[PDB]
Amino acid sequence: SGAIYVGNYRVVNRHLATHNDWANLVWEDSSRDLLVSSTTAQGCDTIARCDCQTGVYYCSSRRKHYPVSFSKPSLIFVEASEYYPARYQSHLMLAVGHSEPGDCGGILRCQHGVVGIVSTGGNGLVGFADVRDLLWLDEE
Ligand SMILES: N#Cc1ccc(CNCc2ccc(F)cc2)cc1
Numbered sequence: 001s002g003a004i005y006v007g008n009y010r011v012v013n014r015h016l017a018t019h020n021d022w023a024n025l026v027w028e029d030s031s032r033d034l035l036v037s038s039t040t041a042q043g044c045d046t047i048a049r050c051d052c053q054t055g056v057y058y059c060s061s062r063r064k065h066y067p068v069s070f071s072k073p074s075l076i077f078v079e080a081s082e083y084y085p086a087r088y089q090s091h092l093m094l095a096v097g098h099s100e101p102g103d104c105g106g107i108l109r110c111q112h113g114v115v116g117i118v119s120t121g122g123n124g125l126v127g128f129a130d131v132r133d134l135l136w137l138d139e140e
């Protein structure tokens with residue numbers, strides 16, 4: 001589990017979004033595994049605006065942050081998981097690392113701020129849903 005709290009937005013994995021998230025929906029994309037809802041309180045996170053390919057991500061199933069190199073966001077085939085069938089996911093970045101389903105929502109960050117959140121795992125990779133292209137998260 002986990003979210004990004006930027007401005008008055010809460011960015012979650014679409015598959016973990018709550019009823020309250022859907023009732024306060026700003027934007028959602030199943031192909032990206034993302035959903036954004038509106039918040040009453042302002043949040044503490046800053047979104048990275050950059051093309052970094054190195055950062056640090058939080059792994060809840062290890063209680064550890066790991067430094068990783070990761071691919072640029074692309075359209076990637078993802079094998080079946082506990083929460084999705086086997087399918088193509090867009091705007092997905094991969095790194096070599098540990099990820100189980102409950103790790104979804106852990107933050108990947110670089111020197112510029114939050115890059116994305118854990119969205120995929122298995123076979124010794126961790127996949128992250130990018131948010132750096134969502135420039136509208138920084139205003140309004
Ligand atoms: N909606 C939806 C939906 C969610 C999951 C699955 C795949 N269930 C079996 C499965 C579990 C774990 C695993 F690692 C591989 C396969 C299908 C549809």
Ligand SMILES: [Zn+2]
Pocket residue numbers: 048049050051052110111112113
């Ligand atoms: Zn960066």
